């Protein structure tokens, strides 16, 4: 029933409490201000358990630190050093994301499809 509803494109706040364990997602991007995007979310990891992040989300900030224009390595450092409670502002940007992943495109509901 859900799969035809448009994925919301407004920014959201996500709070993940992960102690001293990994967040459980991978990032792509960071070159020349392209943005930092979630590319993979580990099943059973803290990001998965949040239920509030998906592939193709841009990370706008972590703990108030603006990552819109971050480099890949400094983004990764910000995330890994954010502390036990990690407050992410995210925004779903599937068109931008789709340019990174082979054979990917965005459908009418905003979902990323890979042929």
């Amino acid at each position: 029933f859900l799969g035809e509803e448009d994925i919301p494109r407004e920014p959201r706040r996500i709070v993940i409490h992960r102690g001293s364990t990994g967040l459980g997602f991978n990032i792509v991007g960071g070159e020349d201000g392209e943005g930092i995007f979630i590319s993979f979310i580990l099943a059973g990891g803290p990001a998965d358990l949040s239920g509030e992040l998906r592939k193709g989300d841009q990370i706008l900030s972590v703990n108030g630190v603006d990552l819109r224009n971050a480099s890949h390595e400094q983004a990764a450092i910000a995330l890994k050093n954010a502390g036990q409670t990690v407050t992410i502002i995210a925004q779903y940007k599937p068109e931008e994301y789709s340019r990174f992943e082979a054979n990917s495109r965005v459908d009418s509901s905003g979902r990323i499809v890979t042929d």
Binding site: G22, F25, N26, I27, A75, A76
Partner: peptide, 6 residues
Amino acid sequence: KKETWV
């Protein structure tokens, strides 16, 4: 090209 696990 980079991908980092966090």
